[PDB]
């Protein structure tokens, strides 16, 4: 059975603060659709070669997908300390996989301003690697309590990109797919 990589050609990608993960079990993998394509803006791999991956086997593959700003794609890498990496999506230092991103300004940015894609600006303590937070609790920045209401030193933790087609390249919406390769002890994704 063919692996369902056609996560990439999904219609709607999730916000980076609430990214989604799909498990890829027993199936034959089609890695050749990737390394013969200049459709991506990054295509950066870690721990594994981009072409030696064809004849490799993993226990299972996990496809993380989300949307981040153009200048925030650099934070989708092991050992990054930005707002996205610390508060939205953290990669482990021993990350073994490939991050892919392609410009989607025409479909994720409207002239009125697409505010659906959000990110977390404030969070107590950085995120563990591969952790995920969806809580919209009013972040308390001071020492007096926030009673579920916003005001001074009580800000909403989620901030939304104002994606618009006239922005610079560094502020245009980029859809990201972080393919991670797991290896435990048991045999399922191959291509010898």
């Amino acid at each position: 059975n063919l692996c369902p990589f056609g996560v990439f050609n999904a219609t709607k990608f999730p916000s980076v603060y609430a990214w989604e993960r799909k498990k890829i079990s027993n199936c034959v993998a089609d890695y050749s659709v990737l390394y013969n394509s200049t459709f991506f803006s990054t295509f950066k791999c870690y721990g594994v070669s981009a072409t030696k991956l064809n004849d490799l086997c993993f226990s299972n593959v996990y496809a993380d997908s989300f949307v981040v700003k153009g200048d925030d794609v650099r934070q989708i890498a092991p050992g990054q300390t930005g707002v996205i990496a610390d508060y939205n999506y953290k990669l482990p230092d021993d990350f073994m996989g490939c991050v892919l991103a392609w410009n989607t300004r025409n479909i994720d940015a409207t002239s009125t301003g697409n505010y659906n894609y959000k990110y977390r600006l404030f969070r107590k303590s950085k995120l563990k690697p591969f952790e995920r937070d969806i809580s919209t609790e009013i972040y308390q920045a001071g020492n007096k309590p926030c009673n579920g209401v916003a005001g001074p030193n009580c800000y909403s933790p989620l901030q939304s990109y104002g994606f618009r087609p006239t922005y610079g390249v560094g502020h245009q919406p980029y859809r990201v797919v972080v393919l991670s390769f797991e290896l435990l002890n048991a045999p399922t994704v191959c291509g010898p």
């Binding site: 600006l121 404030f122 920045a141 030193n153 901030q159 104002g162 006239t166 922005y167 610079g168």
Partner: protein, 596 residues
């Protein structure tokens, strides 16, 4: 959490909230300046009023942090900018009247027209009607009419408004812990917090006046030479020892003496480095001019213009079907958006100006990584200096020839290079006494040293003493000749043009030394020089995070402005001037006037 910790997360919430609202306000104002309609003039205010309402909301929210409790100067810098009560410290009826007179003054200046008493059906406004007269006319009475009409028609309309404009703006500054409105304007150069680099608002007055006296030898000798040439153009009108009539200086106010080149050229026999016809013979358009300017900044190590720049900028007038504001501007809308608004014609002046405006964008592109409140020049005079050093290198004959605009057989004699320096002196050094005398008058008016019974009297006393210029007809206190200038009636500071003139030659002297240039400073081109590019890029990316005393020191190595580089630029011209003025009186008499 510490007060500094609470202020950092506050600025983080502000920077992301302000950048989105500022972009909608900037793009809305772009759609108006490029497409003057009724929907866009209201969208500019709708998006503009929401930004001002958001700013006042964030003003008081920022005042909850005691400025002395913050130790990180970067956040301490941003807090003081937000906590500025600004013009909102006035009551509603005073703030609404101040915004009214500021709009009314800006209206009767831009829409003020005078009519020819000889041909009443031909009426003309400042641009382009009245400005064309002051720029090209050689008739004394014709220049006298346009000069006096502009100050008697629209100048008197601004007199009662400017009196209320001063008293309302003074109360705004005294409430924000300043002496007067002039003290408020001089705060742009103030540096407080950095050890060894502090700088007070009174140090500006001391530094510009001490350096202005070092410029008097060059300006007086040019004034004597220009007076001698102007005597030949207006015989029996100019005393060889008196001041110059204000209407014979080349424009409406005498701010720049550039249009006097046709009367003051040292060697008119030499070929004119005007490549306007040469640009047409090569079938150039506005795209070719800006694409060539893009090629200039890349050769020194700077990047191309952004992809959105070539998509969104307005490099030509979109025709008569869609009227726009044709004032050359460089727009920094944030969010990676960089545009230039300029109705470019196929001429040489628009070619050099295209490098100035693109220089502003290179400055805007560099500090884009800084936080929102720090994305600006070091002081008000840094942007204008960065833009001029681009046109300075792009105006040298060797650069103009190597582009393809001038023939490769142009002999650069000591006569063609003295004609070039004289043209540069009429603009660069001619405006220095005009700028100081204007700001010195505005400084005294806000300090109350010049009462209303001698507003115009003390104005023209300083015109004779400081600038060496006399009014052609006497003006009482009904006139308001300073307000007949744009920057005065539109609430713009003017000392920024004095400092940028000195900064641009400190910048030029530093980069040309790194550019391995050997000849005179006025023959330098920093093209192909990545050494000078990286040296300058260390300054533009700094923005306003570091004080201007450091930013200026980072490139040239000085905590303050210096008049020496300016004098070195015109030193070959200075000696030629002293040779001409041996049998001519150097200086002016403050008592001569073209009437009795």
């Amino acid at each position: 959490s510490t007060i500094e910790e609470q202020a950092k997360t506050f600025l983080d919430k502000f920077n992301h909230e302000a950048e989105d609202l500022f972009y909608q306000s900037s793009l809305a104002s772009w759609n108006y300046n490029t497409n003057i309609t009724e929907e866009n003039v209201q969208n500019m205010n709708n998006a503009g009023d929401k930004w001002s309402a958001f700013l006042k909301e964030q003003s008081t929210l920022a005042q909850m942090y005691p400025l002395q409790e913050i130790q990180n100067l970067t956040v301490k810098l941003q807090l003081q900018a937000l906590q500025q009560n600004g013009s909102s410290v006035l009551s509603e009826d005073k703030s609404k009247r101040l915004n009214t007179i500021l709009n009314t003054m800006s209206t009767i200046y831009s829409t003020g027209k005078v009519c020819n008493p000889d041909n009443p059906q031909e009426c003309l406004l400042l641009e382009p009607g009245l400005n064309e007269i002051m720029a090209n006319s050689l008739d004394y009475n014709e220049r006298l009419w346009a000069w006096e009409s502009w100050r008697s028609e629209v100048g008197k309309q601004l007199r009662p408004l400017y009196e209320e404009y001063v008293v309302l703006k003074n109360e705004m500054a005294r409430a924000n812990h300043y002496e007067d409105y002039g003290d408020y304007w001089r705060g742009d150069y103030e540096v407080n917090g950095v050890d060894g680099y502090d700088y007070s608002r009174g140090q500006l007055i001391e530094d510009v006046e001490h350096t202005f006296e070092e410029i008097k030898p060059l300006y007086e000798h040019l004034h004597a030479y220009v007076r001698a040439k102007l005597m030949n153009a207006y015989p029996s009108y100019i005393s060889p020892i008196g001041c110059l009539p204000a209407h014979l200086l080349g424009d409406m106010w005498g701010r720049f003496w550039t249009n006097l080149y046709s009367l003051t050229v040292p060697f008119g026999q030499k070929p004119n480095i005007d490549v306007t016809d040469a640009m047409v013979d090569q079938a150039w358009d506005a795209q070719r001019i800006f694409k060539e300017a893009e090629k200039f900044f890349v050769s020194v190590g700077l990047p191309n213009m952004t992809q959105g720049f070539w998509e969104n900028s307005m490099l030509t007038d979109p025709g008569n079907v869609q009227k726009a504001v044709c004032h050359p501007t460089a727009w920094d809308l944030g969010k990676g958006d960089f545009r230039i608004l300029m109705c470019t014609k196929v001429t040489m002046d628009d070619f050099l100006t295209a490098h100035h405006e693109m220089g502003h964008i290179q400055y805007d592109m560099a500090y884009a990584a800084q936080p929102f409140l720090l994305r600006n020049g070091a002081n008000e005079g840094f942007h204008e200096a960065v833009g001029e050093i681009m046109s300075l290198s792009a105006a040298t004959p060797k650069h103009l020839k190597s582009i393809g605009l001038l023939s490769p057989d142009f002999q650069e004699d000591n006569e063609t290079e003295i004609n070039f320096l004289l043209k540069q002196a009429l603009t660069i050094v001619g405006t220095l006494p005009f700028t100081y005398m204007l700001e010195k008058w505005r400084w005294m008016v806000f300090k109350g040293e010049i009462p209303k019974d001698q507003w115009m009297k003390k104005w023209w006393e300083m015109k004779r003493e400081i600038v060496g210029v006399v009014e052609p007809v006497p003006h009482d206190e009904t006139y308001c000749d300073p307000a007949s200038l744009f920057h005065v009636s539109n609430d713009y500071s003017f000392i920024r043009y004095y400092t940028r003139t000195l900064y641009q030659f400190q910048f030029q002297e530093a980069l040309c030394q790194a550019a391995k240039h050997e000849g005179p400073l006025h023959k330098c081109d920093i093209s192909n020089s990545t050494e000078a590019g990286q040296k300058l890029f260390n300054m533009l990316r700094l923005g306003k995070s570091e004080p201007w005393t450091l930013a200026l020191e980072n490139v040239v190595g000085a905590k303050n402005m210096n008049v020496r580089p300016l004098l070195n630029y015109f030193e070959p011209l200075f000696t030629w001037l002293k040779d001409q003025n041996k049998n001519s009186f150097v200086g002016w008499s403050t008592d001569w006037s073209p009437y009795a």
